[PDB]
Amino acid sequence: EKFEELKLSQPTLKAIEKMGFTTMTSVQARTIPPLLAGRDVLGAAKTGSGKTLAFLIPAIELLHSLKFKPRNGTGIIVITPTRELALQIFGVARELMEFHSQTFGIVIGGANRRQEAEKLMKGVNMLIATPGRLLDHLQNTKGFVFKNLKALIIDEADRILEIGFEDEMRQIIKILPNEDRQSMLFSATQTTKVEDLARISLRPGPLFINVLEQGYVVCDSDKRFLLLFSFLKRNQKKKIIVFLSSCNSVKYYAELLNYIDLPVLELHGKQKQQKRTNTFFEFCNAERGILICTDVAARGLDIPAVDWIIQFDPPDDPRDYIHRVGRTARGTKGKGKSLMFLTPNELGFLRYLKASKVPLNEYEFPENKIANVQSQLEKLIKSNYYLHQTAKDGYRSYLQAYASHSLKTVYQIDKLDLAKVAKSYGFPVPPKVNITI
Template sequence: ILGAAKTGSGKTLAFLVPSINILYNIKFLPKNGTGVLIISPTRELCLQIYQVCKDLCKYIPQTNGIIIGGMSRNEEKKFIHGINILIATPGRLLDHMQNTKEFIYKNLISLIIDEADRLLQIGFEEEINLIVKRLPKKRQTALFSATQTTKVENLIRLSLQKPIFIEVTTKIATVERLQQGYALVDEDKRFLLLFTFLKRNISKKIMVFFNNCMSVQFYNDLLNYIDIPTFCIHGKKKQNKRLKSFSEFSAAQSAILLCTNVAARGLDIPNVNYIIQYDPPDDSKEYIHRVGRTCRGKDSSGSAIIFLMKHELKFLNYLKFYNIPINQFAYDPSKLINVQSHIESIVTKNFHLHKMAREAFKSYLNGYITYALKDVFDVNNLNLLQTSKNFGLEAPPKVDLNLKLNVKKRKFK
């Protein structure tokens, strides 16, 4: 089975329920080893699938478990031999397949590869290929991918035989209940707009996306320092701290989560009111995944706002290409809470924040250089002095910008 569906459409239940049902009906027990194997790209996604699976298996004899990087390999080794439904990240899974004799997967019935495009995008192509080659050839395979890339097509050829394609489609790429807007913001006022929005919506549940780990950590430290409590998730944060932040934000009625794209795919966080894209995504598909963190469920609603500078407005053309309805978010620039001098004073006097601000500024520029859509996100269009103001810096640190990159332009029909 090759599946594609809009984010938040219930894909996890769609593959878990029939998989569990098969094992239950044939009385597949712990002594038989692993019957269903689910591979997902991130630890958070694996934990989320595991929690749903655990709830579904509460009253049946079939066992379930999870193996992910960041957890104790020796502890996993103790229980892996009797796990009927196993959820795993590819690196740790391959490690156990190669080195753990107790791991029984010769009786595997179903392989489920979730977020296949994301798995391959973040460099797991070799691991996935090695895993698939080790598994029994006689099995059912379900592969879910939001996009069809060359790498995904290669994986389809390797893992699927005469696949049935199932797609849930609509003309609009995002859910209809989602209110979407863009805020046109001056280059040196981006943080002031974010600060004002967070202060005036402190009772809401908000996710804010950035394009690099250092920005997430800097703004998390800065906002907490000035008494705006925030959680943060990014790829460089230790696993136990990531899980703690994710769990606490998920359980909260009102809270602010600062994050990179590590939180953009698949995470099912209840009752998110606002998605703020402080840094724009690399393309329209990543935009869709980010805003998909709200409006999850049949009757839920939410809003998404993307911050765009004047030279970035062409990004709206890419959203229109996917029939994404988006209107300008109107605000009065004179009503922004002007804390610029206060923030600069804090950052200048605080050694930790000043060091973090400089590193985050450099990471932001490096991230900007890597945008694929050079006709929209051209680092030469940035005013470095104005950009540095968003990090509380009085002047921009020196940055060696390598501008000799290929310009990638896309045509519209």
């Protein structure tokens, strides 16, 4: 089927055309009509299978049907376990609403609380917020208009339960209304606890729908960027995909690499969907180049036959990253080597790697030979305002992602050396980041 065969408003149709997706996916084709009808639906759709747009489009349709002013109510609420997923969903919502006149915003853990409170007071008709900060905004912020909750959707309930927000989810359900609220949810899988949570939230009888060496390098925090740059320079003429934990960091790294006179491609949620698809196709068909992508962007995206898979930043979903290699080896003609960067304080991930029992190899590099571009990077940052701002934004995003990592036992902000990270980013003086240390 196609989006043209649905009762979609003209601005929504124009936005969908701007996205570039005209053929409905199986999950989308099966979920969009029931969602538009208002029936509660839950499923085990895999992440990145287009379910995000699948349940976003009905929300926009409901908003366009009600046509209530931004001051009237809060409209739709979206809960996601991770900050990166929240940013991706907000970007998708903004892309879809470009034509639409409704308001949208985010509430992300570790962000400016005052700004989020002001935005909520102004009125947001499409809110995407993590449960941890969503509870705080619901409880200790006067003027919130959550009383008009029309729809509620939960993404990746299994991850939310695993992190430990089940009590937070119960509190949110208790606080939020249930009179006219239509409840839905989606996740890669669903356990007994997830089923109980769905039963608690989903008011009616919900509709059910179903559808290699672990190479790692131990490098210092300050020298990680230089080592990655040297690896890319000496591995040129190949195809390499780099995984990061922040879209801002990906954009900054891509811009810096382009400025250093070496072609590089970026793939982040903040990029326009049409531009995202064009860049992905160009990288796939080029047969040579380097792609810098975020974890969430490549979570469900197709993986061409790439020679290397580099996990520069800690994975957002450790289990998915651990299990990826098994299928990645079979899915590529030439088994793409997997590379991971581990801080000396991040050696705890070796315990999980051993628990996986997959083959592993410890690569080594000489400290004598390195790109040695620290002085040039510092001069460029101190001389260029745009590059300085991009680097600062990337550093802030990386710190925020690190602080929000579920694996607290392996990753901790306290153990991190801020000075070394700033030097790697090119800042002799680490810019301040509002991290709840």
